[PDB]
Each structure stands twice: as structure tokens, then as C-alpha cells.
Amino acid sequence: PELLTMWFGESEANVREIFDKARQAAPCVLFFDELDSIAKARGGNIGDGGGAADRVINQILTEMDGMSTKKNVFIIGATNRPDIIDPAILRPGRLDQLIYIPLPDEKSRVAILKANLRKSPVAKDVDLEFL
Amino acid sequence: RPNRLIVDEAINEDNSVVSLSQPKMDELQLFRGDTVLLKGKKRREAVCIVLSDDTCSDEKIRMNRVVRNNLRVRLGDVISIQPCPDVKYGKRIHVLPIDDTVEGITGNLFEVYLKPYFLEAYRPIRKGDIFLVRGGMRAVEFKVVETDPSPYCIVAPDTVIHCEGEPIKREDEEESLNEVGYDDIGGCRKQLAQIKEMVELPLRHPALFKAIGVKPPRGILLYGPPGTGKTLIARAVANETGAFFFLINGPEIMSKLAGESESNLRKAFEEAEKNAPAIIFIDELDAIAPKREKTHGEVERRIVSQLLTLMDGLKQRAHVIVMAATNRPNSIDPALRRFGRFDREVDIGIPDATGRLEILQIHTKNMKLADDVDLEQVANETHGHVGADLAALCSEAALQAIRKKMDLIDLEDETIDAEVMNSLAVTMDDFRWALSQSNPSALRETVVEVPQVTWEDIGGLEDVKRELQELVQYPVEHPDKFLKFGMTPSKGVLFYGPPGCGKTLLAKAIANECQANFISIKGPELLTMWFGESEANVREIFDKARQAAPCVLFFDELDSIAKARGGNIGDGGGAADRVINQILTEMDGMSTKKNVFIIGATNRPDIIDPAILRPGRLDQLIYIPLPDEKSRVAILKANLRKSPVAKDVDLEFLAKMTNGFSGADLTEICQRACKLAIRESIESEIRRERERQTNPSAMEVEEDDPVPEIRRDHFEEAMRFARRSVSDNDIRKYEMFAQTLQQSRGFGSFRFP
Ligand SMILES: Nc1ncnc2c1ncn2[C@@H]1O[C@H](COP(=O)(O)OP(=O)(O)O)[C@@H](O)[C@H]1O
Ligand SMILES: Nc1ncnc2c1ncn2[C@@H]1O[C@H](COP(=O)(O)OP(=O)(O)O)[C@@H](O)[C@H]1O
Numbered sequence: 106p107e108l109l110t111m112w113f114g115e116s117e118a119n120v121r122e123i124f125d126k127a128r129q130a131a132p133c134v135l136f137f138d139e140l141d142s143i144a145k146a147r148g149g150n151i152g153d154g155g156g157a158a159d160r161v162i163n164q165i166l167t168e169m170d171g172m173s174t175k176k177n178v179f180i181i182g183a184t185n186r187p188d189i190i191d192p193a194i195l196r197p198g199r200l201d202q203l204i205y206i207p208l209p210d211e212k213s214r215v216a217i218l219k220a221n222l223r224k225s226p227v228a229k230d231v232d233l234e235f236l
Numbered sequence: 237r238p239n240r241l242i243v244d245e246a247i248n249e250d251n252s253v254v255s256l257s258q259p260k261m262d263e264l265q266l267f268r269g270d271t272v273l274l275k276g277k278k279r280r281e282a283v284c285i286v287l288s289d290d291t292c293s294d295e296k297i298r299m300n301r302v303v304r305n306n307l308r309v310r311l312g313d314v315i316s317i318q319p320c321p322d323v324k325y326g327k328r329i330h331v332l333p334i335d336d337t338v339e340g341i342t343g344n345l346f347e348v349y350l351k352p353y354f355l356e357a358y359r360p361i362r363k364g365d366i367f368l369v370r371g372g373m374r375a376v377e378f379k380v381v382e383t384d385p386s387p388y389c390i391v392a393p394d395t396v397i398h399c400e401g402e403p404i405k406r407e408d409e410e411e412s413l414n415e416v417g418y419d420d421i422g423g424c425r426k427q428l429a430q431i432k433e434m435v436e437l438p439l440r441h442p443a444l445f446k447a448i449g450v451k452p453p454r455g456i457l458l459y460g461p462p463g464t465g466k467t468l469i470a471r472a473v474a475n476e477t478g479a480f481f482f483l484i485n486g487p488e489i490m491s492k493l494a495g496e497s498e499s500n501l502r503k504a505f506e507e508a509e510k511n512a513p514a515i516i517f518i519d520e521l522d523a524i525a526p527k528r529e530k531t532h533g534e535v536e537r538r539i540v541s542q543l544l545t546l547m548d549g550l551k552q553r554a555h556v557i558v559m560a561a562t563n564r565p566n567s568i569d570p571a572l573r574r575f576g577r578f579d580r581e582v583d584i585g586i587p588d589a590t591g592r593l594e595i596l597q598i599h600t601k602n603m604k605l606a607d608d609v610d611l612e613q614v615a616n617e618t619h620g621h622v623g624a625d626l627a628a629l630c631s632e633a634a635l636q637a638i639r640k641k642m643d644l645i646d647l648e649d650e651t652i653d654a655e656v657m658n659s660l661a662v663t664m665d666d667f668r669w670a671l672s673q674s675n676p677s678a679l680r681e682t683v684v685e686v687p688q689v690t691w692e693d694i695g696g697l698e699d700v701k702r703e704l705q706e707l708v709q710y711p712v713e714h715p716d717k718f719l720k721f722g723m724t725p726s727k728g729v730l731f732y733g734p735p736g737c738g739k740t741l742l743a744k745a746i747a748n749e750c751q752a753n754f755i756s757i758k759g760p761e762l763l764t765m766w767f768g769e770s771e772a773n774v775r776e777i778f779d780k781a782r783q784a785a786p787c788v789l790f791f792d793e794l795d796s797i798a799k800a801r802g803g804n805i806g807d808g809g810g811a812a813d814r815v816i817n818q819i820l821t822e823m824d825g826m827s828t829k830k831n832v833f834i835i836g837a838t839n840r841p842d843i844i845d846p847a848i849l850r851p852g853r854l855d856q857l858i859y860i861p862l863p864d865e866k867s868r869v870a871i872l873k874a875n876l877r878k879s880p881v882a883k884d885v886d887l888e889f890l891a892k893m894t895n896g897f898s899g900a901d902l903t904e905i906c907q908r909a910c911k912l913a914i915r916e917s918i919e920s921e922i923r924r925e926r927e928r929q930t931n932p933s934a935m936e937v938e939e940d941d942p943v944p945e946i947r948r949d950h951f952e953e954a955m956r957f958a959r960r961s962v963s964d965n966d967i968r969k970y971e972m973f974a975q976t977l978q979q980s981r982g983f984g985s986f987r988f989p
Contacts, residue, residue: 106821106824109817110817113817150801151801151809151810152806153806154809224722225721230989231989
């Protein structure tokens, strides 16, 4: 939502201020949730906001290129659809490593339930492993 | 000491009655209708008649303004009650009026005023008091100078009165009952309660407050549409609590020439600080402290800086309270809303129908109404008006009534007569004309109020009623269990189904049952904030919604985004998703504690962007089925209850035959049946005059066949062209969108324990 907010009007000020805030508070783990939102938005009938999409992607690319490697500021991005994203990002000096996150199965699921149902009551009757 | 009690505002209008709670009534061994002696500051004694009331507490005595001005006390003071059953009958009196309430009367004050007041009243009186009697058009107050036996006596049918004598002057202790009080404000009960809560202690008890050593409020903002009566509220508080109300105009200070304007403001603050606990009222704050962009000149910046410095110069020891009045809180310069300066904000909204009723009731206390007055109807008809407009309405209705009959009454040369200004009875023909010529001032504003739809208005939909009652009522009624069980309450509900199934009625009904403010937003408004600016238009709406909690915000036709974006235009998509992005942004940011409930409505759910349908956001979906032959009988009863019903009723083929009708076509069927009835009635009337124009006196009496009646024939002339509002194919697609979830719900078999 914030990415699209700085996609329908201005594009430059917000990226500069957010990267400055991230750099000044080092160390930090900057997070870019739903990096595919712009690609999903402009992939439909809408075909006018592409200029601002170039603006946003260019800002992200430029103030990743301008970050000194001595400063400890990571960048993490999560995308639901990887293929339609810009392949310029997946270049050395930018987001390079790709980690695949599978769907939890069986033995992971019982741990998921154990973590979730800590809550305050209990379930001493039904067996977690069965479900 | 079982005598000391604290005074409080009463409800009864009679001057010589007070309200006591039953335990104090029993403990003091006093009976109903007797006389008791009351005493307070400055050694003032009064006589009154005890009346019962369970609402007041033991320490709380309810008593109205005239007795208070007799006792020379204020709210929250301490008075003591003593038994007085020895009061005897009376004798010669010399009741006299005051000069500044009798100018231009010149009438028989004995017959017009005192006789109605003392007739079957048995009101006791005491020497040296002031009592106010309501009459023809003004307020008249009389004073007693002596009586026999002195001072106590009760007016009896067999006593001698004299209203002859020159008017006396003011007692010189003010005590003017013609000023404002708490009874002159209506429709703003909650806001007045808040103001009393946050102002009464620093002004009434300064010594104890400075003893405790806690920071008092230094500024209060009142913002709302003009004419709602903010200055009235400030004046009422200042007069009743006891203060030195000092008013500072905006334009008057602004237009004072050269750089001398600051000197007046500084002198005002320095003079207010040196007198007493005061209430400085800065009127039209936005006139002298506007936004930074608007301050083209340089004197405005100097004035604003002077105001800020003077406001900051309120070091600890200061009983001065600054109150400011303004329009919407966007014109004020942001630097004024820091801490130490104006921080508290109170919203004085436009009154609703009930509030209009109390305003009209207040403004016509003097006027002599007729027996044809229907003030509740006028209040129900006058939506979109503020206090000043209703005051002007009453005033010019009185002028119309006096104008209609003025030659016959005595126009004299300089004064009036009391008798002639008593048959003046304003009637509904005057008020209808008054409404016919009047321009409302508010109109195009968002209105928040309790909807009047009751659960019985809607028919059927028991499952949806149960789900809504579970979802909205439960979190606010038993909060502890939610916290103790891990469960974290839900935020909103999205409705979907065929159009015309009554989603808006259900939302209004649930808002009424939950007893919370309702705010409705229409599709056209969303389209308006589409084309152009969408930033603030989704900002002040949420600000108002959050400020007036508890609330049930309703979004109608949320699907218009895809309805208009979808097509051959495609260029409105940017400003389009601006709106949805703003909705998501300030709907994911609301605190879970806030009890602001969001409800969405749509009829083409497949095209809604699935970003909204996520956990934390609007998640629960309730399907509203198209009513069919189960419940249309209830719908028809609901929408034909108001009309003068019919004979033989439907209950039958009328409802039975139709299968697949929404509410809209049933309502239009009712409208068409009533239209046919009206057409028949008017045609019979026109025939009656077209027949009697050539006839002599035919003992013309009330026989005109005017009794309303809508027989089966009218309904027959109605269902001959009714149409199926909802097409059959729509059901398929809506139920397929439901089937997506239901097939995702397919796995439901009971597993092993
Ligand atoms: N109970 C009431 N609520 C609101 N307004 C009222 C009430 N009683 C009287 N009024 C009218 O409201 C007017 C207030 O005038 P004004 O000071 O201009 O209001 P504001 O300054 O808030 O615009 C008075 O002239 C009075 O006639
Ligand atoms: N008990 C009822 N059930 C269903 N509809 C009703 C009922 N009573 C009245 N109606 C009609 O339903 C309409 C409500 O429209 P609304 O539900 O807002 O339309 P939409 O569902 O398209 O938003 C009213 O105009 C009214 O004429």
C-alpha cells in the first residue's frame, strides 16, 4: 500500500527519506513487503502509471547502488509471483540470493499448531499430531 | 449533621418545587406537599414545597434557577434543610415589578400575570424574594416588599393583593434571571457534560487544586459549523460557575491599525490575569491565526507569534482558562496544537431531530401557542437546520401571526396593552408558511446520528441477525473473556448478494440496536474523491468516525471502483486505486482498542480486488439470499403497516404467486396501489364540485366520501405489470462465488477424536 501511495503521486522524496532513516539507525533490516504489487497493478487494464513505476524502481536501484558496503544495512524483499518481477534487480550488487520457501507438511504442521495454540487455554483431549 | 446537601439542576419547571430522594425523605420525617425552610450563604431563607423523585441521589437536591437566585448560591454549593410545618395564612401584600422588565407594557398586570400564577397554586411566598412569571411575549419578574404575617405566608384565595406602585430598581447584586444558564442549551448534552467535567474543578475550587499540585488544562477548542451556539456554551459556563468572562473578537483585533494590535491583546491577557478565575474567549480563531500559506503579509505572522508567546506565558500559577472557537480544525496553524497550548478538542455537531425538538421547545417558552401546534412534526420536517435558523423561524412566525391581525388590535402610539397580546396564538398555517420561506444553512455536510430503524422493520434474516449480533455486540459487552481466551475481536464484515435485499436497512437496524452513531457514505461521493484529490477526503472522514466512537461506518457500493474502472476508459485507474489504497492504509492503522466497526456492501463480488479480503482487514463474508416464498408476507406487512391497510388482507395468492422478488418491487407495488387510491379520491372530489356548481344549497355537510380505502381492486390494478427486479442468471453467478468458498469448505467430515 505504501509503495502504491508513493506511486500515484510523487516517487522521489519518500524513498530518499526512508533510506536515510534506515542508514542513520544502523544496524537494521529493511524489509520490502509485496515488491510485486506494482507489477500486478500495471499488468491489467491500467497502463498510465508506468512512468511512476520506473520512478520507484529507479529510486530503489539508485539508493541500493549508492549504499557503501561498510555500512550494515540489509535489504529483504518478498514477492508472491517471482517471474513477472523486474530482472534488473536480480543482479550482483543488488538482491542476488534467492531462497525458496515451501509449503509446510506433516512434521512441520504439528510444530505450527504447537506454536499457535500456546495462547492461554489448552487442548488436553484432542491430539495435535492427528490433525 | 443530616442537613447539609449539595444543589443540582432540576427537571420540573414549577418554581416552588424541589426533588428529594426517598431515603432522605424518610430520615427527615417529612411528608409530601409540606413547606420546608432552606438556608445558604449570606443568610438567605426560602420557602418551597417538597416533591418526590427517585432519580436524584441522597446528597443530590434538585432545584431550579429562581430559587437558586433567591438563595444566592451556585451549583455544587452546600445548603441545609429544616422542617417548617408552622407556616400560616397571609394578608395584605404590595407586589411590585422591576423597571427593566416592564418598559412598554401599560396593562392590567393583576389580571394578565398574577391571577393565572396564583390561581389554584397555593404557592407560599416570603418577604424579600424575586420570582419570575411567564406571560404574553416577554418575561416579567415581581418582588415582594412586605406581607402579613411577616415574613412567611402562603397566598390564599381570600387575600388582598396590590400591584399598584412605581417600578423599583435593580437590587444591585445582579442576579439577573434574563441571562443564560444550563437550561438554555439543548441538543448538546454529552459535550456540555464533558465541558463541566473538565472545567468545574479548576474554577470552583482553586485552592484545593493548587494544593494537590497537578497540571490543569490551559486551553479548549470548540469547532463546528457556524451558528451552532459555541459562544452560548462559553457564556453559560462562565455565568453559572462564576467567573469574569472576557471576550476577544477576531476581526475587531485584526482591524486596529498599525502595529498597535498586539498591545490590545497583551493588555487583554494582563487585565484578565489580575481579576479572578476567568474564561478568555477568542472568537473566530482562524481569522487571526490562519495557515502559513495564507499569511501573505507580515503583520499576521507577528500577531500569531505574539499569541503563541502570551499563551506560553502561563507559568504554573494561573487560573485563567483560554477557550477558542473555530470552524473545521484545518485552518488553524499546526503550531497551536502542541502541548501547553490548545490540546483538548470538543466537537459541537449539528443537532439531530430530537435536538431540534428541544431547541424549538426552548425558543417558544414565552410564545402563546395554539392547540393546533405539532412541534414534533415540524422537528421531523426541518432536517438540515441549526440553532440560529430555528430561532429565526420562531421569530418570524410570530411576526407573521401578529401581522395577520394588526388593524383590529390596538396599535396605540408608543406602547402595547397586556390584554391584546394574549389572544395571539400562532397556528400551523403560520408555521407551514414559515417553512415555505426559509433557506437552510447546513445542507451539504456529513451528519452523524442514531438511525431510527427498529429490528421489527426488517423481516426474516434470522441467521444474519444472529451473526451480526454475535459480531458487533459481544466484544463490547464481555471484554475480559476475549482477552483471557486469546481470541482477538474481528474488525469488519462484507455483505454480498442480489441488489435490493435490504443490506442498508440491516446496517441501520444493527446500529440502532447497538446504540451507536451511524455514518453513511455513498458511491457518488467515492466517485467524487476519485476524480481529483483523494488524500484528505479519506482523512477527515476517518477522523470524524474515530472521534465519535462508538460508531458503525457504512461503505455503500464499494464495487463502483471496478464498475467504473472496468471498460474502455482505463485512464482513471490511478486516481481510482488511490482511493482503495487510502482505505487500506487508514483501515490497517486503526487501533484494535477503538470500537469503530466497518461494514462493506457489494453486489458483484467476483470483480472486487482480493486485497481487501484478507485477515485483519474486512474478512467475514455474509451472503444475503434473495427472499422467496417464505418471508414476503412480512415484507408486505412492514411496508403496508403505515398506509390505512386494506380489507381481506393479502396473506394469500398475492404473496404466494410471486417467487423471486426483492423488496424494491414490493415497495413500488405499494406506492402504485396508493397512487391509484389517491387518483380515485381526487376524481370523486372533482366530480363533486363539477356537479354542485349548478345546484342550490343541498344541505352541504361532511359527506364527501373522504374515508381512505384501498380494496382488492387497487391491488389488481397493480400486479398487472410488476416486473422481476432481479434476473434469474444473477443468482447463478452469486451462488458460484459462494460455491468457491463452500467447495473450499468441502472438507467437513467428523474426524476421529
Ligand atoms: N440550545 C441551543 N443550541 C444551539 N443554539 C442555540 C440554542 N439556543 C439558542 N441558540 C441560538 O444560537 C445562537 C448563537 O449565536 P452565535 O454566538 O453566533 O453562535 P456561534 O458563535 O456558535 O456561531 C443564539 O443567537 C441563539 O439564538
Ligand atoms: N424488510 C425489507 N426487506 C428488504 N427490503 C426492504 C424491506 N423494507 C423495505 N425494503 C426496500 O429495500 C430498499 C433498501 O435498499 P438497499 O438495501 O439499500 O439496496 P442495495 O441492497 O442495492 O444497497 C428500500 O428502498 C426499501 O424500499
